[PDB]
PDB file of C-alpha atoms and ligand atoms in Angstrom:
ATOM      1  CA  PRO Q   1    -127.815  34.077 -84.301  1.00  0.00           C
ATOM      2  CA  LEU Q   2    -130.768  32.612 -86.375  1.00  0.00           C
ATOM      3  CA  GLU Q   3    -132.114  33.540 -89.890  1.00  0.00           C
ATOM      4  CA  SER Q   4    -132.408  37.250 -89.016  1.00  0.00           C
ATOM      5  CA  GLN Q   5    -128.822  37.567 -90.309  1.00  0.00           C
ATOM      6  CA  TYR Q   6    -129.509  36.411 -93.908  1.00  0.00           C
ATOM      7  CA  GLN Q   7    -132.201  37.247 -96.472  1.00  0.00           C
ATOM      8  CA  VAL Q   8    -133.187  34.252 -98.614  1.00  0.00           C
ATOM      9  CA  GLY Q   9    -133.199  34.724-102.391  1.00  0.00           C
ATOM     10  CA  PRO Q  10    -133.980  32.433-105.356  1.00  0.00           C
ATOM     11  CA  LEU Q  11    -133.095  28.735-105.384  1.00  0.00           C
ATOM     12  CA  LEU Q  12    -129.818  28.348-107.308  1.00  0.00           C
ATOM     13  CA  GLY Q  13    -129.760  24.531-107.636  1.00  0.00           C
ATOM     14  CA  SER Q  14    -130.629  21.119-106.188  1.00  0.00           C
ATOM     15  CA  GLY Q  15    -129.471  17.486-106.320  1.00  0.00           C
ATOM     16  CA  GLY Q  16    -127.384  15.018-104.288  1.00  0.00           C
ATOM     17  CA  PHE Q  17    -125.702  17.982-102.533  1.00  0.00           C
ATOM     18  CA  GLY Q  18    -128.988  19.397-101.212  1.00  0.00           C
ATOM     19  CA  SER Q  19    -130.707  22.688-102.067  1.00  0.00           C
ATOM     20  CA  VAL Q  20    -128.699  25.887-102.475  1.00  0.00           C
ATOM     21  CA  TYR Q  21    -130.268  29.346-102.492  1.00  0.00           C
ATOM     22  CA  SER Q  22    -128.852  32.765-103.295  1.00  0.00           C
ATOM     23  CA  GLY Q  23    -128.746  34.905-100.178  1.00  0.00           C
ATOM     24  CA  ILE Q  24    -127.561  38.186 -98.754  1.00  0.00           C
ATOM     25  CA  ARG Q  25    -125.963  38.777 -95.366  1.00  0.00           C
ATOM     26  CA  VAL Q  26    -128.288  41.487 -93.983  1.00  0.00           C
ATOM     27  CA  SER Q  27    -125.538  42.979 -91.788  1.00  0.00           C
ATOM     28  CA  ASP Q  28    -123.382  44.125 -94.762  1.00  0.00           C
ATOM     29  CA  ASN Q  29    -125.242  43.218 -98.003  1.00  0.00           C
ATOM     30  CA  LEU Q  30    -122.704  40.453 -98.712  1.00  0.00           C
ATOM     31  CA  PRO Q  31    -123.567  37.949-101.468  1.00  0.00           C
ATOM     32  CA  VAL Q  32    -123.817  34.447 -99.933  1.00  0.00           C
ATOM     33  CA  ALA Q  33    -125.080  30.958-100.875  1.00  0.00           C
ATOM     34  CA  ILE Q  34    -127.270  29.136 -98.326  1.00  0.00           C
ATOM     35  CA  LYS Q  35    -126.952  25.348 -98.617  1.00  0.00           C
ATOM     36  CA  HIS Q  36    -129.436  23.031 -96.888  1.00  0.00           C
ATOM     37  CA  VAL Q  37    -128.489  19.374 -96.275  1.00  0.00           C
ATOM     38  CA  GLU Q  38    -130.943  16.850 -94.702  1.00  0.00           C
ATOM     39  CA  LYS Q  39    -129.572  14.830 -91.750  1.00  0.00           C
ATOM     40  CA  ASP Q  40    -131.081  11.595 -93.189  1.00  0.00           C
ATOM     41  CA  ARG Q  41    -129.111  12.141 -96.421  1.00  0.00           C
ATOM     42  CA  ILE Q  42    -125.781  12.621 -94.610  1.00  0.00           C
ATOM     43  CA  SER Q  43    -123.965   9.276 -94.745  1.00  0.00           C
ATOM     44  CA  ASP Q  44    -120.503  10.688 -93.961  1.00  0.00           C
ATOM     45  CA  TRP Q  45    -120.202  12.259 -90.526  1.00  0.00           C
ATOM     46  CA  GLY Q  46    -117.080  13.693 -88.954  1.00  0.00           C
ATOM     47  CA  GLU Q  47    -116.040  15.252 -85.687  1.00  0.00           C
ATOM     48  CA  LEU Q  48    -115.116  18.913 -85.400  1.00  0.00           C
ATOM     49  CA  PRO Q  49    -111.679  19.826 -84.001  1.00  0.00           C
ATOM     50  CA  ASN Q  50    -113.372  20.699 -80.656  1.00  0.00           C
ATOM     51  CA  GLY Q  51    -115.477  17.499 -80.789  1.00  0.00           C
ATOM     52  CA  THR Q  52    -119.040  17.657 -82.161  1.00  0.00           C
ATOM     53  CA  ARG Q  53    -121.309  15.769 -84.585  1.00  0.00           C
ATOM     54  CA  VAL Q  54    -121.391  17.606 -87.966  1.00  0.00           C
ATOM     55  CA  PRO Q  55    -121.395  16.608 -91.663  1.00  0.00           C
ATOM     56  CA  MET Q  56    -117.937  15.555 -92.937  1.00  0.00           C
ATOM     57  CA  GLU Q  57    -118.589  18.256 -95.520  1.00  0.00           C
ATOM     58  CA  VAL Q  58    -118.389  20.881 -92.734  1.00  0.00           C
ATOM     59  CA  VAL Q  59    -115.180  19.410 -91.348  1.00  0.00           C
ATOM     60  CA  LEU Q  60    -113.613  19.516 -94.797  1.00  0.00           C
ATOM     61  CA  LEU Q  61    -114.770  23.034 -95.631  1.00  0.00           C
ATOM     62  CA  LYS Q  62    -113.266  24.396 -92.405  1.00  0.00           C
ATOM     63  CA  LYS Q  63    -109.951  22.701 -93.144  1.00  0.00           C
ATOM     64  CA  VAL Q  64    -109.727  24.333 -96.637  1.00  0.00           C
ATOM     65  CA  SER Q  65    -110.933  27.741 -95.406  1.00  0.00           C
ATOM     66  CA  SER Q  66    -108.383  30.461 -96.150  1.00  0.00           C
ATOM     67  CA  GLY Q  67    -107.889  33.802 -97.953  1.00  0.00           C
ATOM     68  CA  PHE Q  68    -107.045  31.729-101.041  1.00  0.00           C
ATOM     69  CA  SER Q  69    -110.008  32.185-103.351  1.00  0.00           C
ATOM     70  CA  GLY Q  70    -109.588  28.874-105.243  1.00  0.00           C
ATOM     71  CA  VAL Q  71    -111.949  27.015-102.940  1.00  0.00           C
ATOM     72  CA  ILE Q  72    -115.342  28.107-101.737  1.00  0.00           C
ATOM     73  CA  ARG Q  73    -115.244  29.546 -98.258  1.00  0.00           C
ATOM     74  CA  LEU Q  74    -117.639  28.476 -95.515  1.00  0.00           C
ATOM     75  CA  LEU Q  75    -118.546  31.707 -93.659  1.00  0.00           C
ATOM     76  CA  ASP Q  76    -120.850  30.104 -91.089  1.00  0.00           C
ATOM     77  CA  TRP Q  77    -123.086  27.081 -90.432  1.00  0.00           C
ATOM     78  CA  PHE Q  78    -126.157  26.150 -88.292  1.00  0.00           C
ATOM     79  CA  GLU Q  79    -127.752  22.929 -86.937  1.00  0.00           C
ATOM     80  CA  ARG Q  80    -131.529  22.621 -87.314  1.00  0.00           C
ATOM     81  CA  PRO Q  81    -133.866  19.822 -86.161  1.00  0.00           C
ATOM     82  CA  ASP Q  82    -133.446  17.652 -89.299  1.00  0.00           C
ATOM     83  CA  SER Q  83    -130.911  19.618 -91.371  1.00  0.00           C
ATOM     84  CA  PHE Q  84    -127.674  21.598 -91.466  1.00  0.00           C
ATOM     85  CA  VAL Q  85    -127.431  24.965 -93.154  1.00  0.00           C
ATOM     86  CA  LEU Q  86    -124.108  26.174 -94.534  1.00  0.00           C
ATOM     87  CA  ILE Q  87    -123.463  29.827 -95.440  1.00  0.00           C
ATOM     88  CA  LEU Q  88    -120.990  29.900 -98.289  1.00  0.00           C
ATOM     89  CA  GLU Q  89    -119.434  32.793-100.145  1.00  0.00           C
ATOM     90  CA  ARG Q  90    -121.056  33.734-103.449  1.00  0.00           C
ATOM     91  CA  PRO Q  91    -119.223  35.400-106.348  1.00  0.00           C
ATOM     92  CA  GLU Q  92    -121.485  37.634-108.476  1.00  0.00           C
ATOM     93  CA  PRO Q  93    -121.669  37.364-111.410  1.00  0.00           C
ATOM     94  CA  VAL Q  94    -120.875  33.665-111.579  1.00  0.00           C
ATOM     95  CA  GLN Q  95    -121.509  30.700-113.853  1.00  0.00           C
ATOM     96  CA  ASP Q  96    -120.523  27.085-113.130  1.00  0.00           C
ATOM     97  CA  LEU Q  97    -118.272  25.329-115.624  1.00  0.00           C
ATOM     98  CA  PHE Q  98    -120.905  22.810-116.800  1.00  0.00           C
ATOM     99  CA  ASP Q  99    -123.256  25.614-117.865  1.00  0.00           C
ATOM    100  CA  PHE Q 100    -120.313  27.557-119.361  1.00  0.00           C
ATOM    101  CA  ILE Q 101    -119.342  24.612-121.578  1.00  0.00           C
ATOM    102  CA  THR Q 102    -122.951  23.828-122.343  1.00  0.00           C
ATOM    103  CA  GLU Q 103    -123.354  27.326-123.796  1.00  0.00           C
ATOM    104  CA  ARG Q 104    -119.917  27.834-125.349  1.00  0.00           C
ATOM    105  CA  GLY Q 105    -119.029  24.315-126.425  1.00  0.00           C
ATOM    106  CA  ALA Q 106    -115.417  23.182-126.499  1.00  0.00           C
ATOM    107  CA  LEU Q 107    -113.024  25.742-125.050  1.00  0.00           C
ATOM    108  CA  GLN Q 108    -110.031  27.197-126.847  1.00  0.00           C
ATOM    109  CA  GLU Q 109    -106.902  25.729-125.318  1.00  0.00           C
ATOM    110  CA  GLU Q 110    -105.584  29.039-123.883  1.00  0.00           C
ATOM    111  CA  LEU Q 111    -108.818  29.237-121.890  1.00  0.00           C
ATOM    112  CA  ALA Q 112    -108.757  25.534-120.951  1.00  0.00           C
ATOM    113  CA  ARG Q 113    -105.156  26.032-119.807  1.00  0.00           C
ATOM    114  CA  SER Q 114    -106.087  28.968-117.503  1.00  0.00           C
ATOM    115  CA  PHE Q 115    -109.067  27.053-116.102  1.00  0.00           C
ATOM    116  CA  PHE Q 116    -107.236  23.743-115.665  1.00  0.00           C
ATOM    117  CA  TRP Q 117    -104.308  25.493-114.042  1.00  0.00           C
ATOM    118  CA  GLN Q 118    -106.573  27.155-111.475  1.00  0.00           C
ATOM    119  CA  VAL Q 119    -108.300  23.846-110.689  1.00  0.00           C
ATOM    120  CA  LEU Q 120    -104.893  22.265-110.124  1.00  0.00           C
ATOM    121  CA  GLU Q 121    -103.984  25.040-107.637  1.00  0.00           C
ATOM    122  CA  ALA Q 122    -107.328  24.563-105.960  1.00  0.00           C
ATOM    123  CA  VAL Q 123    -107.006  20.769-105.682  1.00  0.00           C
ATOM    124  CA  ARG Q 124    -103.473  21.198-104.368  1.00  0.00           C
ATOM    125  CA  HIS Q 125    -104.614  23.558-101.650  1.00  0.00           C
ATOM    126  CA  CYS Q 126    -107.227  20.976-100.681  1.00  0.00           C
ATOM    127  CA  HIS Q 127    -104.593  18.176-100.423  1.00  0.00           C
ATOM    128  CA  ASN Q 128    -102.171  20.508 -98.598  1.00  0.00           C
ATOM    129  CA  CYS Q 129    -104.972  21.090 -96.067  1.00  0.00           C
ATOM    130  CA  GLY Q 130    -105.391  17.321 -95.859  1.00  0.00           C
ATOM    131  CA  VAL Q 131    -108.700  17.198 -97.765  1.00  0.00           C
ATOM    132  CA  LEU Q 132    -109.587  14.979-100.729  1.00  0.00           C
ATOM    133  CA  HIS Q 133    -112.527  16.340-102.769  1.00  0.00           C
ATOM    134  CA  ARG Q 134    -113.511  13.108-104.587  1.00  0.00           C
ATOM    135  CA  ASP Q 135    -115.946  14.852-106.956  1.00  0.00           C
ATOM    136  CA  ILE Q 136    -113.889  17.112-109.233  1.00  0.00           C
ATOM    137  CA  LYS Q 137    -116.039  17.858-112.292  1.00  0.00           C
ATOM    138  CA  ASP Q 138    -117.360  20.799-114.273  1.00  0.00           C
ATOM    139  CA  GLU Q 139    -120.626  21.065-112.212  1.00  0.00           C
ATOM    140  CA  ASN Q 140    -118.491  21.578-109.094  1.00  0.00           C
ATOM    141  CA  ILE Q 141    -116.416  24.503-110.390  1.00  0.00           C
ATOM    142  CA  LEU Q 142    -117.656  28.117-110.319  1.00  0.00           C
ATOM    143  CA  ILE Q 143    -116.342  30.871-112.590  1.00  0.00           C
ATOM    144  CA  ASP Q 144    -116.135  34.321-111.015  1.00  0.00           C
ATOM    145  CA  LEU Q 145    -116.754  35.955-114.399  1.00  0.00           C
ATOM    146  CA  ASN Q 146    -115.482  39.419-113.422  1.00  0.00           C
ATOM    147  CA  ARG Q 147    -112.137  38.292-111.933  1.00  0.00           C
ATOM    148  CA  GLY Q 148    -111.594  35.219-114.156  1.00  0.00           C
ATOM    149  CA  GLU Q 149    -111.079  33.143-110.984  1.00  0.00           C
ATOM    150  CA  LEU Q 150    -112.330  29.567-110.528  1.00  0.00           C
ATOM    151  CA  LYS Q 151    -113.645  28.120-107.274  1.00  0.00           C
ATOM    152  CA  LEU Q 152    -114.057  24.456-106.369  1.00  0.00           C
ATOM    153  CA  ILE Q 153    -117.420  23.724-104.701  1.00  0.00           C
ATOM    154  CA  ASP Q 154    -119.378  20.882-103.065  1.00  0.00           C
ATOM    155  CA  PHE Q 155    -117.273  18.924-100.596  1.00  0.00           C
ATOM    156  CA  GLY Q 156    -120.184  16.562 -99.860  1.00  0.00           C
ATOM    157  CA  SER Q 157    -118.429  13.495-101.273  1.00  0.00           C
ATOM    158  CA  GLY Q 158    -114.986  14.304 -99.868  1.00  0.00           C
ATOM    159  CA  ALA Q 159    -112.932  12.777 -97.092  1.00  0.00           C
ATOM    160  CA  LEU Q 160    -109.835  13.389 -95.054  1.00  0.00           C
ATOM    161  CA  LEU Q 161    -106.839  12.842 -97.341  1.00  0.00           C
ATOM    162  CA  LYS Q 162    -104.971   9.618 -96.540  1.00  0.00           C
ATOM    163  CA  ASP Q 163    -102.092   7.569 -97.913  1.00  0.00           C
ATOM    164  CA  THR Q 164    -104.004   4.287 -97.545  1.00  0.00           C
ATOM    165  CA  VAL Q 165    -106.592   2.755 -99.868  1.00  0.00           C
ATOM    166  CA  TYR Q 166    -110.164   4.031-100.103  1.00  0.00           C
ATOM    167  CA  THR Q 167    -112.821   1.280-100.348  1.00  0.00           C
ATOM    168  CA  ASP Q 168    -115.761   3.777-100.351  1.00  0.00           C
ATOM    169  CA  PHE Q 169    -116.907   6.334-102.987  1.00  0.00           C
ATOM    170  CA  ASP Q 170    -120.069   8.371-103.600  1.00  0.00           C
ATOM    171  CA  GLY Q 171    -118.810  10.857-106.195  1.00  0.00           C
ATOM    172  CA  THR Q 172    -119.590  10.868-109.913  1.00  0.00           C
ATOM    173  CA  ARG Q 173    -119.115   7.498-111.629  1.00  0.00           C
ATOM    174  CA  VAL Q 174    -118.261   8.913-115.099  1.00  0.00           C
ATOM    175  CA  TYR Q 175    -115.278  10.733-113.479  1.00  0.00           C
ATOM    176  CA  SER Q 176    -114.351   7.700-111.378  1.00  0.00           C
ATOM    177  CA  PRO Q 177    -111.234   5.658-112.226  1.00  0.00           C
ATOM    178  CA  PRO Q 178    -110.952   2.172-113.675  1.00  0.00           C
ATOM    179  CA  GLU Q 179    -109.552   0.850-110.393  1.00  0.00           C
ATOM    180  CA  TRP Q 180    -112.783   1.951-108.648  1.00  0.00           C
ATOM    181  CA  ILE Q 181    -115.034   0.464-111.353  1.00  0.00           C
ATOM    182  CA  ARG Q 182    -113.262  -2.925-111.396  1.00  0.00           C
ATOM    183  CA  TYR Q 183    -112.099  -3.349-107.770  1.00  0.00           C
ATOM    184  CA  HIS Q 184    -113.828  -0.785-105.509  1.00  0.00           C
ATOM    185  CA  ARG Q 185    -110.335   0.387-104.523  1.00  0.00           C
ATOM    186  CA  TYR Q 186    -108.398   3.582-105.266  1.00  0.00           C
ATOM    187  CA  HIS Q 187    -105.813   5.918-103.713  1.00  0.00           C
ATOM    188  CA  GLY Q 188    -106.684   9.592-103.304  1.00  0.00           C
ATOM    189  CA  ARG Q 189    -104.083  11.397-105.375  1.00  0.00           C
ATOM    190  CA  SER Q 190    -104.202   9.143-108.443  1.00  0.00           C
ATOM    191  CA  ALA Q 191    -108.002   9.017-108.417  1.00  0.00           C
ATOM    192  CA  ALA Q 192    -107.971  12.831-108.320  1.00  0.00           C
ATOM    193  CA  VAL Q 193    -105.574  12.932-111.291  1.00  0.00           C
ATOM    194  CA  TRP Q 194    -107.838  10.564-113.207  1.00  0.00           C
ATOM    195  CA  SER Q 195    -110.847  12.884-112.721  1.00  0.00           C
ATOM    196  CA  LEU Q 196    -108.676  15.844-113.676  1.00  0.00           C
ATOM    197  CA  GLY Q 197    -107.997  14.098-116.978  1.00  0.00           C
ATOM    198  CA  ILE Q 198    -111.738  13.637-117.482  1.00  0.00           C
ATOM    199  CA  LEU Q 199    -112.206  17.350-116.701  1.00  0.00           C
ATOM    200  CA  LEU Q 200    -109.528  18.474-119.165  1.00  0.00           C
ATOM    201  CA  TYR Q 201    -110.979  16.323-121.961  1.00  0.00           C
ATOM    202  CA  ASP Q 202    -114.362  17.798-121.069  1.00  0.00           C
ATOM    203  CA  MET Q 203    -112.970  21.313-121.391  1.00  0.00           C
ATOM    204  CA  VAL Q 204    -111.217  20.934-124.782  1.00  0.00           C
ATOM    205  CA  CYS Q 205    -113.796  18.614-126.444  1.00  0.00           C
ATOM    206  CA  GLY Q 206    -117.017  19.965-124.887  1.00  0.00           C
ATOM    207  CA  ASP Q 207    -118.114  16.635-123.311  1.00  0.00           C
ATOM    208  CA  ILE Q 208    -116.705  13.831-121.122  1.00  0.00           C
ATOM    209  CA  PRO Q 209    -114.900  10.972-122.959  1.00  0.00           C
ATOM    210  CA  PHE Q 210    -116.482   8.013-121.148  1.00  0.00           C
ATOM    211  CA  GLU Q 211    -120.158   7.345-120.435  1.00  0.00           C
ATOM    212  CA  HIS Q 212    -120.120   3.585-119.690  1.00  0.00           C
ATOM    213  CA  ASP Q 213    -118.186   1.354-117.288  1.00  0.00           C
ATOM    214  CA  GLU Q 214    -116.857  -0.563-120.320  1.00  0.00           C
ATOM    215  CA  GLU Q 215    -115.311   2.644-121.699  1.00  0.00           C
ATOM    216  CA  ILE Q 216    -113.634   3.634-118.419  1.00  0.00           C
ATOM    217  CA  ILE Q 217    -111.952   0.214-117.974  1.00  0.00           C
ATOM    218  CA  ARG Q 218    -110.772   0.175-121.582  1.00  0.00           C
ATOM    219  CA  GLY Q 219    -109.342   3.684-121.119  1.00  0.00           C
ATOM    220  CA  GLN Q 220    -109.179   4.414-124.886  1.00  0.00           C
ATOM    221  CA  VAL Q 221    -109.368   8.178-125.591  1.00  0.00           C
ATOM    222  CA  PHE Q 222    -110.898   9.354-128.882  1.00  0.00           C
ATOM    223  CA  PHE Q 223    -110.736  13.084-129.576  1.00  0.00           C
ATOM    224  CA  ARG Q 224    -113.897  14.361-131.182  1.00  0.00           C
ATOM    225  CA  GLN Q 225    -112.583  17.939-131.467  1.00  0.00           C
ATOM    226  CA  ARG Q 226    -109.287  19.257-132.778  1.00  0.00           C
ATOM    227  CA  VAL Q 227    -106.910  19.221-129.771  1.00  0.00           C
ATOM    228  CA  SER Q 228    -103.137  19.893-129.784  1.00  0.00           C
ATOM    229  CA  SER Q 229    -100.817  16.868-129.426  1.00  0.00           C
ATOM    230  CA  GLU Q 230     -99.390  18.376-126.230  1.00  0.00           C
ATOM    231  CA  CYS Q 231    -102.863  18.592-124.688  1.00  0.00           C
ATOM    232  CA  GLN Q 232    -103.824  15.090-125.939  1.00  0.00           C
ATOM    233  CA  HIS Q 233    -100.577  13.797-124.373  1.00  0.00           C
ATOM    234  CA  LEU Q 234    -101.300  15.242-120.913  1.00  0.00           C
ATOM    235  CA  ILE Q 235    -104.927  14.019-121.001  1.00  0.00           C
ATOM    236  CA  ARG Q 236    -103.769  10.573-121.996  1.00  0.00           C
ATOM    237  CA  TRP Q 237    -101.185  10.681-119.215  1.00  0.00           C
ATOM    238  CA  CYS Q 238    -103.844  11.638-116.605  1.00  0.00           C
ATOM    239  CA  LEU Q 239    -106.063   8.840-117.930  1.00  0.00           C
ATOM    240  CA  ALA Q 240    -103.404   6.111-117.662  1.00  0.00           C
ATOM    241  CA  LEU Q 241    -105.059   2.836-116.606  1.00  0.00           C
ATOM    242  CA  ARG Q 242    -102.401   1.973-113.986  1.00  0.00           C
ATOM    243  CA  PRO Q 243    -102.661   4.567-111.170  1.00  0.00           C
ATOM    244  CA  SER Q 244     -98.835   4.627-110.773  1.00  0.00           C
ATOM    245  CA  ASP Q 245     -98.499   5.615-114.482  1.00  0.00           C
ATOM    246  CA  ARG Q 246    -100.429   8.857-113.829  1.00  0.00           C
ATOM    247  CA  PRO Q 247     -98.566  12.135-113.373  1.00  0.00           C
ATOM    248  CA  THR Q 248     -98.175  13.842-109.996  1.00  0.00           C
ATOM    249  CA  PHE Q 249     -99.577  17.386-109.700  1.00  0.00           C
ATOM    250  CA  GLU Q 250     -96.008  18.667-110.112  1.00  0.00           C
ATOM    251  CA  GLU Q 251     -95.666  16.703-113.349  1.00  0.00           C
ATOM    252  CA  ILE Q 252     -98.989  18.018-114.736  1.00  0.00           C
ATOM    253  CA  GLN Q 253     -98.115  21.641-114.009  1.00  0.00           C
ATOM    254  CA  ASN Q 254     -94.567  21.176-115.442  1.00  0.00           C
ATOM    255  CA  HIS Q 255     -96.011  19.632-118.640  1.00  0.00           C
ATOM    256  CA  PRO Q 256     -95.242  21.569-121.830  1.00  0.00           C
ATOM    257  CA  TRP Q 257     -98.984  22.102-122.514  1.00  0.00           C
ATOM    258  CA  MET Q 258     -99.376  23.949-119.170  1.00  0.00           C
ATOM    259  CA  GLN Q 259     -96.667  26.573-119.773  1.00  0.00           C
ATOM    260  CA  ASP Q 260     -97.330  30.333-119.984  1.00  0.00           C
ATOM    261  CA  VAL Q 261    -100.710  30.340-118.260  1.00  0.00           C
ATOM    262  CA  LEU Q 262    -102.764  33.487-118.386  1.00  0.00           C
ATOM    263  CA  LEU Q 263    -103.330  35.255-115.100  1.00  0.00           C
ATOM    264  CA  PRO Q 264    -106.998  35.170-114.029  1.00  0.00           C
ATOM    265  CA  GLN Q 265    -107.800  38.833-114.773  1.00  0.00           C
ATOM    266  CA  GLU Q 266    -106.180  38.431-118.225  1.00  0.00           C
ATOM    267  CA  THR Q 267    -108.406  35.366-118.741  1.00  0.00           C
ATOM    268  CA  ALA Q 268    -111.530  37.416-117.910  1.00  0.00           C
ATOM    269  CA  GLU Q 269    -110.485  40.245-120.280  1.00  0.00           C
ATOM    270  CA  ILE Q 270    -109.855  37.974-123.287  1.00  0.00           C
ATOM    271  CA  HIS Q 271    -112.512  35.247-122.843  1.00  0.00           C
ATOM    272  CA  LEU Q 272    -115.160  36.304-120.320  1.00  0.00           C
ATOM    273  CA  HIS Q 273    -115.439  39.807-121.914  1.00  0.00           C
ATOM    274  CA  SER Q 274    -114.532  41.702-118.720  1.00  0.00           C
TER     275      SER Q 274
HETATM  276  O1  LI7 I 301    -121.893  29.304-103.993  1.00  0.00           O
HETATM  277  C1  LI7 I 301    -122.598  29.115-105.060  1.00  0.00           C
HETATM  278  N1  LI7 I 301    -122.923  30.154-105.883  1.00  0.00           N
HETATM  279  C2  LI7 I 301    -123.678  29.618-106.943  1.00  0.00           C
HETATM  280  C3  LI7 I 301    -124.285  30.194-108.075  1.00  0.00           C
HETATM  281  C4  LI7 I 301    -124.988  29.386-108.992  1.00  0.00           C
HETATM  282  C5  LI7 I 301    -125.117  27.993-108.819  1.00  0.00           C
HETATM  283  C6  LI7 I 301    -124.545  27.359-107.719  1.00  0.00           C
HETATM  284  C7  LI7 I 301    -123.852  28.161-106.816  1.00  0.00           C
HETATM  285  C8  LI7 I 301    -123.142  27.802-105.582  1.00  0.00           C
HETATM  286  N2  LI7 I 301    -123.164  26.506-105.146  1.00  0.00           N
HETATM  287  C9  LI7 I 301    -122.511  25.857-104.091  1.00  0.00           C
HETATM  288  C10 LI7 I 301    -122.708  24.472-103.923  1.00  0.00           C
HETATM  289  C11 LI7 I 301    -122.005  23.762-102.928  1.00  0.00           C
HETATM  290  C12 LI7 I 301    -121.075  24.456-102.136  1.00  0.00           C
HETATM  291  O2  LI7 I 301    -120.356  23.883-101.197  1.00  0.00           O
HETATM  292  C13 LI7 I 301    -120.866  25.814-102.337  1.00  0.00           C
HETATM  293  C14 LI7 I 301    -121.563  26.517-103.309  1.00  0.00           C
END
């Protein structure tokens, strides 16, 4: 074991998730991402299936780990004196969705449809594995530019999926639902759908719709870019004020705006010039 297995590269990013570097598994020259999280900054702790103290983030990552490429895969992890290090897979080339939108502005709907659709599949796999992400946003989605495949990252605000009410939340406030802002209460699925509405608006308009608490609770959507009525309808549906008025995942994916999605490789060929 140890750090004789990986070769540390350049720092890729840092924030409330920790510090993530580009790395390479020395044994087979595999692209990886090495994430460092400080023990003092870990508020949410969980217990591993076998029974050990590790970040909830690790527990969640293991539960969503499969051959399905829609969620980042945890290849290994290590416990250090005052930190945990997570070895995650790393697509190359890659660009996260926030940077992609920052550079390209509002996305054409065919592209938003392919991206949104893949996020939905990804979120669904999480929930099917009994994991709630709680921080769906553009900064937490990676685009494998060659394959046109999206990957959901950063499970550091997540939790075990449950049917009961959540009274805690440390995700992004501007993607958080009116029921959280006003009452510090939300249910997993409907909160997720609310953030998915914020993400879709972000994709087709080039920016989030709400910046202030006042705006979230009002829930009034103004489209700053030209967006089809079908797309506006689905966004509006995802951003319903009453959680029970929001669509299920099945309803979102059955929506008329979501029909005839491009396959990922097709998406890369048309829009990511691959
Ligand atoms: O895997 C990654 N490749 C990248 C390339 C550029 C910028 C960020 C990243 C990654 N970040 C991660 C952050 C939290 C995770 O749980 C997993 C990956």
